[PDB]
Amino acid sequence: KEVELTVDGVKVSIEAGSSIIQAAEKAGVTIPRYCYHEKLAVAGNCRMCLVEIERSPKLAASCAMPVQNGMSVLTNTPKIKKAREGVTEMLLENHPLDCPVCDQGGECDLQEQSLRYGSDRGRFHEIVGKRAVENKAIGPLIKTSMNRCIHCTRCVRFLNDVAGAPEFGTAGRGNDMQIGTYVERNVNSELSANVIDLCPVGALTSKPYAFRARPWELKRTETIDVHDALGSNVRVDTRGIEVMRVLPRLNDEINEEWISDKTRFACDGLKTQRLTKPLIRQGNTFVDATWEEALATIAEGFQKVQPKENEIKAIVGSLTDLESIVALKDLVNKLGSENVSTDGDATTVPPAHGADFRSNYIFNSTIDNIEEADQILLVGTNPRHEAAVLNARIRKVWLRSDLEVHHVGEEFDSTFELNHLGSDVNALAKALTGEVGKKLSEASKPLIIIGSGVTETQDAEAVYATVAKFVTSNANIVTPEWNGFNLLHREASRVGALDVGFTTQSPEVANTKAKFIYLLGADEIVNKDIPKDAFVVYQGHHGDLGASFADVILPGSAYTEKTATYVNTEGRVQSTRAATNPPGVAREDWMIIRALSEYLGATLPYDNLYEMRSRLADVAPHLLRHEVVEPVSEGIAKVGFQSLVKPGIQSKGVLLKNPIENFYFTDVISKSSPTMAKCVGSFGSKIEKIKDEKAN
Amino acid sequence: KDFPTTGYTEVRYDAEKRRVVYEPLELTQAWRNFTVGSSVWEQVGDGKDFTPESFKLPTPAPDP
Amino acid sequence: TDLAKELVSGAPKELITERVARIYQEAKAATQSGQHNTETWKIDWDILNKGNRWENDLMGYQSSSDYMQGTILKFDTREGAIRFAKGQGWDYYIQEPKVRRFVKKDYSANFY
Amino acid sequence: TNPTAFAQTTRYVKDSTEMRTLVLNLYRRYLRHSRGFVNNYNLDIPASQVRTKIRQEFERQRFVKDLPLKNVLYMKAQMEFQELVNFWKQQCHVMQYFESIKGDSFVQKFLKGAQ
Amino acid sequence: STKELTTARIKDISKPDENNLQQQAPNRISPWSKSQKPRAEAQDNVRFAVKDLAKQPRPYAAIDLIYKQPIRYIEHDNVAVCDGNGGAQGHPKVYINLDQNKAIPCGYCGLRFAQAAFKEDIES
Amino acid sequence: SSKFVFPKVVKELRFFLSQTGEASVPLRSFLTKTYPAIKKANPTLPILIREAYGIPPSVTARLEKGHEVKTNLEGFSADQIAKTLQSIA
Numbered sequence A: 001k002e003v004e005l006t007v008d009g010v011k012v013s014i015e016a017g018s019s020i021i022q023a024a025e026k027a028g029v030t031i032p033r034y035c036y037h038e039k040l041a042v043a044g045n046c047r048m049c050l051v052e053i054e055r056s057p058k059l060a061a062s063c064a065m066p067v068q069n070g071m072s073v074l075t076n077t078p079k080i081k082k083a084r085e086g087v088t089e090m091l092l093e094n095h096p097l098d099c100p101v102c103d104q105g106g107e108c109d110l111q112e113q114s115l116r117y118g119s120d121r122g123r124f125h126e127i128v129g130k131r132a133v134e135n136k137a138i139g140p141l142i143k144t145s146m147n148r149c150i151h152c153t154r155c156v157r158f159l160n161d162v163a164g165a166p167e168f169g170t171a172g173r174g175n176d177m178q179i180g181t182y183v184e185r186n187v188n189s190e191l192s193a194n195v196i197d198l199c200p201v202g203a204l205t206s207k208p209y210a211f212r213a214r215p216w217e218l219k220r221t222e223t224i225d226v227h228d229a230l231g232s233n234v235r236v237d238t239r240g241i242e243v244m245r246v247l248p249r250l251n252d253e254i255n256e257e258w259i260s261d262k263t264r265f266a267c268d269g270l271k272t273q274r275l276t277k278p279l280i281r282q283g284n285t286f287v288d289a290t291w292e293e294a295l296a297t298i299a300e301g302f303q304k305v306q307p308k309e310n311e312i313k314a315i316v317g318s319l320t321d322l323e324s325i326v327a328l329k330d331l332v333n334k335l336g337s338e339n340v341s342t343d344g345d346a347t348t349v350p351p352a353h354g355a356d357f358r359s360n361y362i363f364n365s366t367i368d369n370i371e372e373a374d375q376i377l378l379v380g381t382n383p384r385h386e387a388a389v390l391n392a393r394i395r396k397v398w399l400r401s402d403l404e405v406h407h408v409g410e411e412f413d414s415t416f417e418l419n420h421l422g423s424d425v426n427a428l429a430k431a432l433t434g435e436v437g438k439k440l441s442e443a444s445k446p447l448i449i450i451g452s453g454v455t456e457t458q459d460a461e462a463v464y465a466t467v468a469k470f471v472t473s474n475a476n477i478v479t480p481e482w483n484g485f486n487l488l489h490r491e492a493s494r495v496g497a498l499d500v501g502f503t504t505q506s507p508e509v510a511n512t513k514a515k516f517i518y519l520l521g522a523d524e525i526v527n528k529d530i531p532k533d534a535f536v537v538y539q540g541h542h543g544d545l546g547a548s549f550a551d552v553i554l555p556g557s558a559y560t561e562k563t564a565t566y567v568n569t570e571g572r573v574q575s576t577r578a579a580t581n582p583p584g585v586a587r588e589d590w591m592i593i594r595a596l597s598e599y600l601g602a603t604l605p606y607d608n609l610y611e612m613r614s615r616l617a618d619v620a621p622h623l624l625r626h627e628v629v630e631p632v633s634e635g636i637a638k639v640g641f642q643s644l645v646k647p648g649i650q651s652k653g654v655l656l657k658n659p660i661e662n663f664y665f666t667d668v669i670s671k672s673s674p675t676m677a678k679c680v681g682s683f684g685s686k687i688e689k690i691k692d693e694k695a696n
Numbered sequence B: 001k002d003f004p005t006t007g008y009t010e011v012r013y014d015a016e017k018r019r020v021v022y023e024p025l026e027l028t029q030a031w032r033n034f035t036v037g038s039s040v041w042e043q044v045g046d047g048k049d050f051t052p053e054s055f056k057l058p059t060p061a062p063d064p
Numbered sequence C: 001t002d003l004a005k006e007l008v009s010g011a012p013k014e015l016i017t018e019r020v021a022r023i024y025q026e027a028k029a030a031t032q033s034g035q036h037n038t039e040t041w042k043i044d045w046d047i048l049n050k051g052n053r054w055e056n057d058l059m060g061y062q063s064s065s066d067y068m069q070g071t072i073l074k075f076d077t078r079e080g081a082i083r084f085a086k087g088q089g090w091d092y093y094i095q096e097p098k099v100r101r102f103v104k105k106d107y108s109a110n111f112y
Numbered sequence D: 001t002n003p004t005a006f007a008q009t010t011r012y013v014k015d016s017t018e019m020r021t022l023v024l025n026l027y028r029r030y031l032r033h034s035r036g037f038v039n040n041y042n043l044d045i046p047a048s049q050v051r052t053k054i055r056q057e058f059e060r061q062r063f064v065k066d067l068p069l070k071n072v073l074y075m076k077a078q079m080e081f082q083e084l085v086n087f088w089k090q091q092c093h094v095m096q097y098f099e100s101i102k103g104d105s106f107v108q109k110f111l112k113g114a115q
Numbered sequence E: 001s002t003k004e005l006t007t008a009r010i011k012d013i014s015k016p017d018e019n020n021l022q023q024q025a026p027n028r029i030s031p032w033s034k035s036q037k038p039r040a041e042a043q044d045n046v047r048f049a050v051k052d053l054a055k056q057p058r059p060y061a062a063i064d065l066i067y068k069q070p071i072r073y074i075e076h077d078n079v080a081v082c083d084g085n086g087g088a089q090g091h092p093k094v095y096i097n098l099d100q101n102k103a104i105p106c107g108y109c110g111l112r113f114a115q116a117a118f119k120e121d122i123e124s
Numbered sequence F: 001s002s003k004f005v006f007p008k009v010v011k012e013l014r015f016f017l018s019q020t021g022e023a024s025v026p027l028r029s030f031l032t033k034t035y036p037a038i039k040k041a042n043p044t045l046p047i048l049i050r051e052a053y054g055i056p057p058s059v060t061a062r063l064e065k066g067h068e069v070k071t072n073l074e075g076f077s078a079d080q081i082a083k084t085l086q087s088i089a
């Protein structure tokens, strides 16, 4: 297949059908470009990538011209460099003199390529003046200065194809062509803000980040995104103590250089409602207290109420790190209590997927392989909200092949076409044995996706039993070279909590009226019972319902202020990196548990991260391999699928309502982010409004 | 290269000891590293060949 | 290489006992499409759990007691970075860069 | 040009045994001048402690195995002596050399910010 | 009060007084940025205990001044050209588009330009 | 089911084994053929099976006051392990 070609004397071996620019980029030759992006459809309009081919008079758009065999490609002829300076002299003909006031200042491709490939002088002193355009208003997240657009259509190609938001396009003709939405309406996509990164010029910039920093000030720290369970790789930029912006970074297995609008514009919640001093409840208000006084009060309060063996309850929040989970799990068992669980809304005491077998509560197919899946079945999942970036991955497959997606649950407005089947367990029951179930078995690598919201229904066990019954009796679904069962998580500390077994499987214990409740970042306990005679401690970084109920509050650090371990939905183990310091006297999250133990007579053996990181090897030896997935062996997986199948289960016929009823308010940082408040007002809880009432 | 530009320690006059003493480094304004915002594109090409034509190995000419 | 070369460098003991260095290759920035800052390997030190940055009361500066905050080293081979880290006896940890997966891109694909 | 007082040539030794004779010889030279160190530097401690702390720093390097490390630690060994004899360091430096000074519990370091 | 003196507003509520030293500026009471420290809190400090607050620097707030200018109105053209009224001693020349029915301020100067045909609606 | 009803001191059982390799085969064979009976008699006992590459087999049992009893199972056969598990009790 491969065609051997030489670019400027460098031999190139690439796949056939590739374009010249990919061949040149592999040989190391740098070909300037504006309109070509390696995740978008090819348009050939910017005319900057022009090269010379030996058997032609006509310059070739190397981003569009497919590769040949034996072809000789030139890139550094004086003829080409004349063309590059001509094109540069055209883009800057109408470009405004905005660089000082332009938020793209130190990181603009029109600057660096013009500096490198253009002339050093301009020949435009015309008296009529430049072209001026009116800025279009497309929401509270994207700040448009359309004077600066170079008409490269990356915004159009991304939003139409990747994002699935067809309201953005080119309206007009020639010198009056105006990228926008023609009529005034806000752009509605959870991935709409990735256009800010694609727009090479200052035409589309961040509105929350407007005018606040220059790119040479910021310090770039590579960490992970924990607003949803995918764990998308991000880049956090800090100017001293503050975190200024969050951007995606390349990881072809998880996020593929995109992050949802929740991930990047929730950075401003880290400066608001923070817990900075330990607070002790006195009367009906809180007062400041030192770590000596606050730790003593918890130690004193614990002995006053004297919770018994299993009357001590530990609740873990969505954002909580894995090191604090094991620190807390060890601490409570050191007091001899197993009433340890999460703040979710699960129904059955042993969660339907359980914690015994990893293969029953992860994304066994791995995200990088969703590309090659033939048929996908959605069970009660709304990826447009639960895992936004994963949804765009499924669309990209469905656009380039004959993938057919089947959905069972509550109907939602989706980016790609669905084949709706029903909205209850019985609807899924006929579908598995019917025409659609036949489709999956005939396919090579079919996919069954179960959402996180399946558990929060009354029929949590029926669906897991039903689907497993189909899986337990097939050969295509589970092969040596394929594991077709997948579970989609949405809270960033589920797989971490389940990998360490921070979940109680005793129904009587889960019903025990616990007296001492230790809230570890749990902020959704409205349904959870908290008796008036319970002494509650909340250790978190944000003031919300979890801290309001507490009697002593111990400040903790956010994911941008500590080194921690997170396991995403597909089982990959990822460790964050510290970008700033926690504010005030706030301490590390697992350090509090160690220090709290010394006051409670349960002194934990750990003394530092490395000692605690040795403990993660004990609970599960795979928790020491960063960015490495340990797939479940095929034989042992089939054991777990069987124990989910249980005769004698009644399908109550409950609608598989999605758990995310507000896309922007899902975690603690999101609820305290001023920018997310604007989005709900402008876009709505489900990103459905097309008009911005809030406009001033 | 591994030695930081601001060094490790600094001196001040201690009243108790009546003498100038060394203390560990502590900057009131931490140094700002603007060097991160360097060029992401290569700025100068491969150069030009200026070897004398008397110091290059001759190309063996093709045969008839 | 094998020698404990740190005993001649005069560096404070805390770089061996109390600090963690990182060997990494800088990632490509989302904003710009250049691919040159991601071809040299670099060493940077982790920040401190307290005293990395704090606001100066008088003028609102960014005070710091970390003397390695503005120290970044450059290399051209991965091995040279690891060898140099080994020579100084640094407690480092390597961050393997992600590799973009090849996908052929064709102009005609917009209709086929 | 002539070298200054108490100077020595810089030669890279190649035998382990040869170095220890130089190392042991140098040790008494530190010990011999100890009273003068107190007198010239007006030290507030008797010369006994000056002899005391000299010995400790020699032992700190006792267990080096590789030879090239041995020389450099000996090359710098001589230099510190030469500066000390010739009154090149100031009184502030020498005082602070000998004026130097159990770790806190986990709660204590946690309480005050730790490191 | 300390309610206006500590929160930024687009326009004030009461008439500013030049003698009031607690105002953010002599011609404006409230601050004009969300992250600008109020002047009342800034001078409530130990270093001002024995100072003379009337002699500390109090430049006139530039936000209040710039809105005292009239709106330039362009005749039979929807594009205004601004250069800081100094040419080589002003800001770079920037072209402003006036299609929208509002006064578009200049990016550098802050002068507001509009169309003449739109003046009546704008002046409402 | 044999002696699969553990005392009330046992509160957690964890099995470590490699996805490949000889030494992990016996523990895999046991867990694949003996788990369904063990769970059927121990509904409230959580039994975690966690797999990592290149590691020898091992089993951890957790007693009261947080004590965890590690039990290496390298070279044990499909029937010797049944004695090892009960030897915890």
Ligand code: SF4
Pocket (backbone or CB within 6 Å): A095, A096, A097, A098, A099, A102, A103, A104, A105, A106, A108, A109, A110, A111, A148, A200, A201, A202, A203
């Ligand atoms: S987009 Fe680039 S060239 Fe245009 S004004 Fe902004 S910084 Fe200058």
Ligand code: SF4
Pocket (backbone or CB within 6 Å): A148, A149, A150, A151, A152, A153, A154, A155, A156, A179, A198, A199, A200, A201, A203, A204
């Ligand atoms: S707005 Fe930006 S991304 Fe869209 S065509 Fe113009 S330059 Fe390209």
Ligand code: FES
Pocket (backbone or CB within 6 Å): A032, A033, A034, A035, A036, A043, A044, A045, A046, A047, A048, A049, A050, A061, A062, A063, A064
């Ligand atoms: S990069 Fe090929 S024409 Fe734009």
Ligand SMILES: [K+]
Pocket (backbone or CB within 6 Å): A104, A196, A197, A198, A199, A200, A201, A202, A203, A204, A205
């Ligand atoms: K941009």
Ligand SMILES: [Zn+2]
Pocket (backbone or CB within 6 Å): E082, E083, E084, E091, E106, E107, E108, E109, E110, E111
């Ligand atoms: Zn102007």
